[PDB]
Structure formats: structure tokens, C-alpha cells
């Protein structure tokens, strides 16, 4: 479907629960802040135990944030930023510590990479993540390869989890086969491990009762569905989830943007010209065949990739609505909608590149150094 | 354990060597060890207890060309209960360390036991520490040996987990399915554990001790039941740029009721535990050690005893140091001149001081000592690793 995938159905067959006006109102109530547009516009549409997190936050109880990034390469696209942009907002609004897993071991196992390459992509991607604005005093960005060997609790949990997840379970959840290397088969435990606070003793005082909130693209849910199942089996609380939709590929919402097909992506390193070019020449249009027909029948926002992008990056709700109405009425031609998006993306990407340029190795190193964060858990 | 576990003579090891594709330790190899070490080869070697190997000549070539090599063996801490059989590989390894003068690495697989058994991480780990005491009691040099818990070292090593992952990358579920008989129903922890046992075969898993060196020859002494793990390790090694580990296989220490089984810590009276009192040792031998003697004393004087099925005699071949006395007991038992009671009495006079001495040495292992042994650190050996 050109309308993108059916998320309402995805929620159902996934067992998650939808983020309704009720939950969005509570989030605004508890925080006293207007909810981020990702929630208002349905971009972050699903969740698991978000009310629990809210209860905890409601009663001054602690909780922490956790997301990850598979460093497949030094090239990242705007799609990759969505969950991070949101996680950064969550960190500022709730003012909690954040844990960001860089699965360099995952990509070593799955791709034709060297340990050093994989590790090197984590460090490089971390600069982009730091460019999103995370507070150096409230966030630990770690590489699985490095951290496994310098944590008195990370591996211990990986093992616990490994004892409670069978090969059948992962064949059924992730689709592994008898031909997959043992590394792949047991990897899910690595990604599940950061859901438990005692995986990070340096930041949590050996405590294991701290609520964990995991914001992520819906495609990561199977790992945490599995995590939540074992949490009780090993005496730990279930991590909560906040699911986001996929950022659409240029060719159409039928697919999500993917570094695999570079033609469907707008990279964080693309020049202003390349951005303009990819949008004009490749962004699927919900507009009409001829401009005459466009003026007459108007465009279809529900399948127009450029409009969808504005939904993610145009913050002003009024300007977005105006644009929706004028495109739907024909008052605006896809060429203008296109130009409107381009004027939003170019600065968004240029600014990001400017931020990235500021994060030095000394800075990346501190972010990645296991340490006590400016929080007290006693 | 597959063929011969029915015969009273125990497993057929020469037929096991062919199956496993290993090499038999013959007189040439034994004499080469003697010439290379300037020592009389340990009796386990002289008597065929350590009968098989893989690349031992490679280790010897390296040693003779002044190249270095290190030792690697391990223990699965199923419980605090260790028996006489568990000492065999350690006693031999301790001899290998003194004789060749090389660093030693000993893996305590608490994670393996946590995976396979009904234990808590703290239990498994404490078993590692306790067992570590008995192992230290075998006389290992604290300046030449590093004993580590898996649960501990994994989380404090810059090279261990990396090698485990490299190994995990080159071993398929199918591969371990056909080697260890794993199945779709096992936990993922087990499926991949073989990589944990494989990892210490490579020197860069111990950066502190070998200074990031990646080419140091490794010798693994163990009971043949551990070979599968290393047939696998030897396979992946080249695939990941590392040298293959050499091996020295030992036979199984017999269970009291017969060489049909292997002495297992599960059967309290199938073994002579290191904690047993003099009286308990005496009792176990006389009452439970399968006899190769004849049904009646008359048949015995006429047709003599059978040393190939007699458990007490098998134990003597493992612990009676004096070759001549062992032969005399063998000759006399076979001729029927000696009764099983007398043979039994000889073994008891050997086992009691042995176990007594071990229990006494183990009492000398203070908390601080076990800690230093398990603390990653540079050992009394230097390795040069130059590069720009
Ligand atoms: N009946 C017997 N007769 C003689 N020696 C025996 C007997 N039963 C056990 N052993 C030796 O004891 C050590 C521990 O083996 P476990 O199976 O307890 O422990 C285990 O489960 C191993 N996977 C632990 C391990 C980890 N890495 C290693 C490297 C080499 C040898 C062993 C290991 C071993 O040295 C073993 O050869
Ligand atoms: N496995 C994810 C990265 C990741 C690890 N942990 C996470 C937690 C939340 C979101 C993503 C992650 C990927 O391949 O991209
Ligand atoms: Cl609603
Ligand atoms: Cl309400
Ligand atoms: Cl690839
Ligand atoms: Cl010979
Ligand atoms: Cl033999
Ligand atoms: Cl058990
Ligand atoms: Cl490799
Ligand atoms: Cl008589
Ligand atoms: Cl140098």
C-alpha cells in the first residue's frame, strides 16, 4: 500500500497497545509540557507499559532510557535520527539518564566486517548520536565489544538471559536457522541485557529495580517482547516500550528508508544540492499527473512522501496544516510542496553536520566511558 | 565415551584415537620430551595414561627453537565436591609447567555450569573459587599461572570477549549440533558456550600476560572427553588468523564399580573425594573397588587375578610412583600369589597420604592467595611485540 504499512494492524498482531489521546494527555499532565509532535501526529504510536513509567515518574520513583544503533557503516540517513530525536526529548522532559547501545558485535556477526571496522563505525555513529544533543552528563553511549569486557554486570545478565531463551524461541521470533552462526543465535541476549539496570553498576548502585523505558522503531519490538518475557523469570522488572513508525523511503511509503538502497535515502552527509535533487527527482508524489489536473482535483497527502517527511520535521502545526489543505485543494503544486520540504531538510541536515563537527574524539571518548552520571540512586 | 563402555577393561582408547583422528603418543615422542626437558617423562606418559595428542611435535619443535608456548586446561565447577579423578589432568599440567617452564592459563567455567545446572550465578561462581583452592593445592607456581572465572574475566578483559565473538562468527548451529549433540530445545547459552571454551586457546585472549601477542603456541592437556571442544577450536583457528592449539589427551579415571564408567562426582561412592577421611578411603576401596580377582581364593591361587579389569590396580598405575613396586604388584596379583585384599591394602597406603597431603596443602590456600591467582596480571614471563 502506498499509504505506508497498516500500523493499527501491526499493533494488534504484535500484542502492543496504541498510544491514545488519553495516554498523550497524561504524558502532558505528568510533565507539564506540551507533548512532542511525534506523539501528537502519531509517529510514536505504540507502547508497552508507558502508564507504569508514568506511575513511577508520578511518584518520584526513578527510571532510565535505553535505545541502540546497529553501526552497519559510517553512513546514516535522516530515518536513523527519528528514534534519537525523540529519545533526546524524553531525556529533557523527564530529565532521566540515558543508555545507548552500539551493537558493533551484532554488525560483525551479520556483515562482512572486521572487528575494528565494526568498532570504528560505532565510534563514528556515536558522533552523530551526540550531534542530536544528548547531555554528556546524563548519557552513556557504549560499544558492546568494549563494554562487555569492562562491566562487572553486563555479561552476567547476558548469561542469565541466555539460560532462559531457547533456540526454538529465537527461530520463531527472529527466524534463525540451523545454518546461522552461533553468534547470531545468541545475540538477542546482548540486546536484551541493557534493559536491566544492574548491567550498568557504574551508573546504578547495584540496583536492579529501576524502571527501564525503551523508545525505538517498531521493528525492534521482537527483541524486547522476548526481553519482557524473561524479565520475571530472572527477577527483573519488564522494560517499557515506545514504538515509532518507519521513516518512509523516497520511492514510496511501501518501504522504509534503508541504507541498503542508497537511492531511497537522504544521507546526513548529502550536500544541499543532493538533497534538493533526491527530493525533486525521487520523492514519490501524491500529486496529479498534470498541473491542470492538480489544480482541478488536488493532491493526495496520504501517499505523498514529501508531505509525510514534513510530518516528521516541520514543527509548526499551523504551517503543516496550511500545507495539507493547500495541497489537498490544488492551491499548492507538488513542486512547491517539494520546495517546502527541501527548505526544511537542507537546514536540518546542515545544522546536524555543524553539530557533528563539534564532537571531538575527547568528547566521544567521555560519552563512551563507563562512569557515574549526574544522578543519585541510593 | 561410546565404544568400550561395556567392557570391564574400560574404553578401547586405541580405537578412540582412530575415531577422533588424533595421534598416539609413542616411544619416539616420549623420548623427545625427555631430551627436550632433561627430565624423566612423567609416569602418566610412561604408563599410557596420557596416550593421545595433536601437534605435540609442533610444541616440541617450538620449544627446541627457543620459541614460546603456554599451557591451557580448565575445570567445570559443578560443586565443591572434587574427586581423585579431577586431579589427573592438573597433576600432569603442573608437571608440564615445572618441566618446560611456561605460563599456564586455567579456565573455571562457572558460566557453563550455570547454564547446564540448576545453580545461581553466585553458587556457580563460589564453586569456581572453592575448586580453585584444590587446584592451587596441586602446587602451581603463582608467578606462572592465571586462574580465572568465566563470569569474572569476561567482564574485565579487553581481548577475551572479542575472540569469543570472532569464534562465534565462524561456527554454525549445525556444526555444534553434530559435535555436542545440541538440539533446537537447548537454551542459546549452551549453543554458543563452545566458543567460550575455545577462546583461551588464543594468546591475545590474555593481553596482560602475553602483551597482545597473537602467535604464541598453546598446549592443552585434558581428558579425551574434552577433545570435541578442541577439534572445533583447531578448525576455526585458521579461519580467524590464529594458530591451532596442540593437545595431550588422558584416559578416564575409572569409577570404583568398574572401568565401564568414569568416576563421576554425582555417585558419592563411585569416587574417592578429596575431602574423604583416611577411614572413608579405606572403606571405599575395600567395599566398593571392583575386583579383578577370582570368585574363590582357590581359583585365585590357580588362575590368578586380572589387572585389566581390577579398579584398585588401575588406581595404582595412576598413583604408585615407583615403577618396580607397581610391576611387582602386577606380577604377584596375576600369578595369584597376592590376594585382592593385599592389593587393596597397597592402594590404601598410597591414597591416604596422597589425599591427606592435598587436604593439608589446600588448608594453606588463604583467601588472599586465591585472589591473586584469579587476578588478571602480568606473569613472570616477558613477550616482545614490536610494530609501528
Ligand atoms: N575421569 C576423569 N579422569 C581424568 N581426568 C578427568 C576425569 N574427569 C574429568 N577430568 C579432567 O578434569 C578437568 C575438569 O573437567 P570437568 O568436566 O569437571 O570441567 C569441564 O566441564 C571442562 N569443559 C572445563 C574446561 C574448560 N576449558 C578446558 C580446557 C581443557 C580441559 C578442560 C577444560 C579437565 O581437565 C578434565 O580433563
Ligand atoms: N539492533 C538495533 C540496534 C539496537 C540495539 N539496542 C537497541 C535498543 C533500541 C533500539 C535499537 C537498538 C539495530 O540493528 O539497529
Ligand atoms: Cl484516541
Ligand atoms: Cl483525559
Ligand atoms: Cl554485508
Ligand atoms: Cl611405540
Ligand atoms: Cl592406551
Ligand atoms: Cl543439576
Ligand atoms: Cl575475522
Ligand atoms: Cl591360602
Ligand atoms: Cl613497539
DSSP string for B120-136: -HHHHHHHHHHHHHHHH
Closest ligand relative to B88 C-alpha: 1
B180 burial level (CB within 10 Å; 0-12, 13-18, 19+):
middle
C-alpha A334/C-alpha A341 separation (Å) is 10
Best A104, A115, A159, A189 residue to mutate vs chain B (most B CBs within 10 Å)? A159
Q: In this structure, are residues B239 and B170 in contact, taking their beta carbons and an 8 Å threshold?
A: yes
Distance between Cα B377 and ligand 9 center (Å): 27
Instruction: List phi, psi (to 5°) of A66.
Output: -155, 120
Look at A183 and B192 and tell me if their CB atoms are within 8 Å: yes
**Continuous segment of H or E residues that includes residue B51:** strand B50-54
Choose among A257, A306, A259: nearest CA to A79: A257
Kindly state the cell numbers that stand for A188. Answer: 538477542
C-alpha A216/C-alpha A70 separation (Å) is 12
Look at B115 and A159 and tell me if their CB atoms are within 8 Å: yes
Helix (H, G, I), strand (E, B), or coil: what is residue B168? helix
- Cα-only R_g, chain A: 21
Choose among A133, A132, A113, A11: nearest CA to A70: A113
Q: Which residue of A has its CA nearest to B171?
A: A181
Distance between Cα A217 and ligand 3 center (Å): 21
Choose among A16, A55, A19, A10: nearest CA to A38: A19
Residues of A near B (CB-CB distance < 8 A)? 105, 108-109, 115, 145-146, 148-156, 159-160, 162-168, 170-171, 176-183, 185-186, 188-189
- Cα-only R_g, chain B: 21
Spell out which residues have Cβ within 5 A of ligand 11, the ion: B 386
- Provide the 10 A C-beta neighbour count for residue A131: 20
Q: Which long-range contacts (CB under 8 A, 24 or more apart) does A87-94 make?
A: A87/A134, A87/A215, A88/A132, A88/A133, A88/A134, A89/A36, A89/A38, A90/A65, A90/A213, A90/A215, A90/A242, A91/A65, A91/A134, A91/A135, A91/A138, A91/A139, A93/A31, A93/A33, A93/A36, A94/A31, A94/A57, A94/A63, A94/A65
C-alpha A154/C-alpha B272 separation (Å) is 39
Ligand 2: does its nearest atom lie under 6 Å from the Cβ of A70? Answer: yes
Helix (H, G, I), strand (E, B), or coil: what is residue B155? helix
In chain A, what residues touch B159 (CB-CB under 8 Å)? 149
Q: Which long-range contacts (CB under 8 A, 24 or more apart) does B26-30 make?
A: B29/B53, B29/B56, B29/B57
Cα dihedral A19, A22, A27, A28 in deg (nearest 10): 130
The full 3-state SS of chain A, as one line of letters, equals CCCCCCHHHHHHHHCCEECCHHHHHHHHHHHCCCCCHHHHCCCEEEEECHHHHHHHHHCCCCEEEEEEECCCCCCCEHHHHHHHHHHHHHHHHHCCCEEEEECHHHHHHHCCCCHHHHHHHHHHHHHHHHCCCCCCCCEEEEEHHHHHCCCCCHHHHHHHHHHCCEHHHHHHHHCCCCCCEHHHHHHHHHHHHHHCHHHCCCCCCCCCCCEEEEEEEHHHHHHHHHHHHHHHHCCCCCCEEEEECCCEECCEEEEECCCCCHHHCCECCCCHHHHHHHHHHHCCCCCCCCHHHHHHHCCCHHHCHHHHHHHHHCCCHHHHHHHHHHHHHCCCCHHHHHHHHHHHHHHHHHHHHHHHHHCCHHHHHHHCCCCCCCCCCC
Q: Which long-range contacts (CB under 8 A, 24 or more apart) does A336-343 make?
A: A337/A287, A337/A299, A337/A304, A337/A306, A337/A307, A337/A310, A338/A279, A338/A280, A338/A283, A338/A306, A340/A306, A340/A310, A341/A279, A341/A283, A341/A306, A341/A307, A341/A309, A341/A310, A342/A275, A342/A276, A342/A279, A342/A280
- Resolution of this model in Å is 2.4
C-alpha B135/C-alpha B90 separation (Å) is 7
C-alpha A56/C-alpha A58 separation (Å) is 5
Q: In this structure, are residues B310 and B279 in contact, taking their beta carbons and an 8 Å threshold?
A: no
In chain B, what residues touch A162 (CB-CB under 8 Å)? 115, 187-189, 192
Choose among B57, B171, B153, B165: nearest CA to B109: B153
C-alpha B333/C-alpha B300 separation (Å) is 9
Choose among B154, B53, B147, B46: nearest CA to B95: B46
Distance between Cα B212 and ligand 11 center (Å): 11
- Strand pairing of A211-217 and A63-69? parallel
Residue nearest to atom 5 of ligand 2 (CA): A68
Domains of chain A (ranges, CATH numbers): 1-257 (3.40.50.620), 258-378 (1.10.240.10)
Cα dist from B12 to A49, A143, B261, whole Å: 61, 50, 13
Residue nearest to atom 15 of ligand 2 (CA): A70
Q: Which long-range contacts (CB under 8 A, 24 or more apart) does A258-265 make?
A: A258/A79, A259/A72, A259/A73, A259/A75, A259/A76, A259/A77, A262/A75, A265/A77, A265/A78, A265/A79
Terminal C-alpha separation, chain A: 51
Q: Which long-range contacts (CB under 8 A, 24 or more apart) does A332-337 make?
A: A332/A299, A333/A287, A333/A291, A333/A294, A334/A285, A334/A286, A334/A287, A334/A294, A334/A299, A334/A304, A334/A306, A335/A280, A337/A287, A337/A299, A337/A304, A337/A306, A337/A307, A337/A310
Look at A149 and B170 and tell me if their CB atoms are within 8 Å: no
Closest ligand relative to B120 C-alpha: 8
Residue nearest to atom 14 of ligand 1 (CA): B75
- Strand pairing of B104-108 and B23-24? unpaired
Residues with Cβ < 8 Å from B259, sequence gap 6 or more?
Answer: B7, B8, B9, B10, B11, B252, B290, B309, B311, B314
C-alpha A17/C-alpha A45 separation (Å) is 9
Cα dist from A139 to A101, A310, A370, B182, whole Å: 11, 29, 10, 40
Q: In this structure, are residues B146 and B209 in contact, taking their beta carbons and an 8 Å threshold?
A: yes
Residues with Cβ < 8 Å from A65, sequence gap 6 or more?
Answer: A87, A90, A91, A94, A96, A97, A98, A99, A212, A213, A214, A215
Look at A150 and B159 and tell me if their CB atoms are within 8 Å: no
Residues with Cβ < 8 Å from B2, sequence gap 6 or more?
Answer: B16, B19
Residues in chain A: 378
Query: Could you tell me how far CA B215 lies from the centroid of its own chain?
Result: 24
Of B114, B157, B173, the CB nearest to A182: B173
C-alpha B52/C-alpha A234 separation (Å) is 43
Distance between Cα B41 and ligand 6 center (Å): 15
Residues with Cβ < 8 Å from A370, sequence gap 6 or more?
Answer: A140, A142, A147, A150, A151, A200, A202, A203
Look at B115 and A162 and tell me if their CB atoms are within 8 Å: yes
Residues in chain B: 388
Per DSSP, B11 falls in state -
Best A149, A164, A191 residue to mutate vs chain B (most B CBs within 10 Å)? A149
Query: Could you tell me how far CA B65 lies from the centroid of its own chain?
Result: 27
Look at B158 and A152 and tell me if their CB atoms are within 8 Å: no
Q: In this structure, are residues B51 and B84 in contact, taking their beta carbons and an 8 Å threshold?
A: no
A150 burial level (CB within 10 Å; 0-12, 13-18, 19+):
middle
In chain A, what residues touch B171 (CB-CB under 8 Å)? 181-183
Distance between Cα B20 and ligand 8 center (Å): 29
Best A142, A170, A183 residue to mutate vs chain B (most B CBs within 10 Å)? A183
C-alpha B152/C-alpha B77 separation (Å) is 14
- Provide the 10 A C-beta neighbour count for residue B66: 6
Look at A162 and B187 and tell me if their CB atoms are within 8 Å: yes
Look at B161 and A182 and tell me if their CB atoms are within 8 Å: no
Per DSSP, B158 falls in state S
Look at A168 and B157 and tell me if their CB atoms are within 8 Å: no
Choose among A166, A86, A70, A80: nearest CA to A118: A70
- Strand pairing of B23-24 and B217-223? unpaired
C-alpha B349/C-alpha A50 separation (Å) is 71
Look at A151 and B155 and tell me if their CB atoms are within 8 Å: yes
Å from B111 to nearest chain A CA? Answer: 7
Terminal C-alpha separation, chain B: 50
Of B151, B156, B170, the CB nearest to A181: B170
Find residue B71's DSSP bridge partners.
Answer: B104, B219
Distance between Cα A75 and ligand 5 center (Å): 14
C-alpha A72/C-alpha A110 separation (Å) is 9
Angle between helices A167-174 and B188-198 (to 10 degrees): 110
Distance between Cα A52 and ligand 2 center (Å): 22
Q: In this structure, are residues A138 and A91 in contact, taking their beta carbons and an 8 Å threshold?
A: yes
| Residue that the C-alpha cell 585382592 belongs to | B340
Find residue B320's DSSP bridge partners.
Answer: none
Choose among B232, B233, B174: nearest CA to B205: B233
Residues with Cβ < 8 Å from A357, sequence gap 6 or more?
Answer: none
Helix (H, G, I), strand (E, B), or coil: what is residue B368? helix
Helix (H, G, I), strand (E, B), or coil: what is residue B382? coil
Find residue B107's DSSP bridge partners.
Answer: B74, B148
C-alpha A332/C-alpha A323 separation (Å) is 8
Of A154, A181, A186, the CB nearest to B189: A186
Choose among A237, A146, A72, A30: nearest CA to B161: A146
Q: In this structure, are residues B359 and B274 in contact, taking their beta carbons and an 8 Å threshold?
A: yes
- Provide the 10 A C-beta neighbour count for residue A66: 25
Amino acid at each position: 500500500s502506498a499509504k505506508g504499512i497498516d500500523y493499527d494492524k501491526l499493533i494488534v498482531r504484535f500484542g502492543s497497545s496504541k498510544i491514545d489521546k488519553e495516554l498523550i494527555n497524561r504524558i502532558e499532565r505528568a510533565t507539564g509540557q506540551r507533548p512532542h509532535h511525534f506523539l501528537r501526529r502519531g509517529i510514536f504510536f505504540s507502547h508497552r507499559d508507558m502508564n507504569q513509567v508514568l506511575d513511577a515518574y508520578e511518584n518520584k520513583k526513578p527510571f532510565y532510557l535505553y535505545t541502540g544503533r546497529g553501526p552497519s557503516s559510517e553512513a546514516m540517513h535522516v530515518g536513523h535520527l527519528i528514534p534519537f530525536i525523540f529519545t533526546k526529548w524524553l531525556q529533557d522532559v523527564f530529565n532521566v539518564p540515558l543508555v545507548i547501545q552500539m551493537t558493533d558485535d551484532e554488525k560483525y556477526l551479520w556483515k562482512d566486517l572486521t572487528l575494528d571496522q565494526a568498532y570504528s563505525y560505532a565510534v563514528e555513529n556515536a558522533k552523530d548520536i551526540i550531534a542530536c544533543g544528548f547531555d554528556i552528563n546524563k548519557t552513556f553511549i557504549f560499544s558492546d565489544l568494549d563494554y562487555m569486557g569492562m562491566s562487572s554486570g553486563f555479561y552476567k545478565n547476558v548469561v542469565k538471559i541466555q539460560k532462559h531463551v531457547t533456540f526454538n524461541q529465537v527461530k520463531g521470533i527472529f527466524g534463525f536457522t540451523d545454518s546461522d552462526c552461533i553468534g547470531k543465535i545468541s545475540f538477542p541476549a546482548i540486546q536484551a541485557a541493557p534493559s536491566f539496570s544492574n548491567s550498568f553498576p557504574q551508573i546504578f548502585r547495584d540496583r536492579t529495580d529501576i524502571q527501564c523505558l525503551i523508545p525505538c522503531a517498531i521493528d525492534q519490538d521482537p527483541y524486547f517482547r522476548m526481553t519482557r518475557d524473561v524479565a520475571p523469570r530472572i527477577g527483573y522488572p519488564k522494560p517499557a516500550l515506545l514504538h515509532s513508525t518507519f521513516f518512509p523511503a523516497l520511492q514510496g511509503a511501501q518501504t522504509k528508508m534503508s541504507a541498503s538502497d542508497p537511492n531511497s535515502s537522504i544521507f546526513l552527509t548529502d550536500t544541499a544540492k543532493q538533497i534538493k535533487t533526491k527530493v525533486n527527482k525521487h520523492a514519490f508524489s501524491g500529486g496529479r499527473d498534470t498541473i491542470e489536473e492538480h489544480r482541478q482535483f488536488g493532491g493526495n497527502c496520504d501517499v505523498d512522501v514529501s508531505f509525510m517527511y514534513l510530518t516528521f520535521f516541520l514543527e509548526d502545526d499551523d504551517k503543516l496544516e496550511q500545507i495539507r489543505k493547500d495541497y489537498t485543494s490544488g492551491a499548492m503544486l507538488t513542486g512547491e510542496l517539494k520546495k517546502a520540504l527541501i527548505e526544511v531538510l537542507q537546514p536540518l541536515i546542515a545544522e546536524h553536520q555543524a553539530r557533528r563537527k563539534e564532537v571531538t574524539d575527547e568528547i566521544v571518548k567521555e560519552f563512551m566511558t563507563p562512569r557515574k552520571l549526574s544522578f543519585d540512586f541510593q
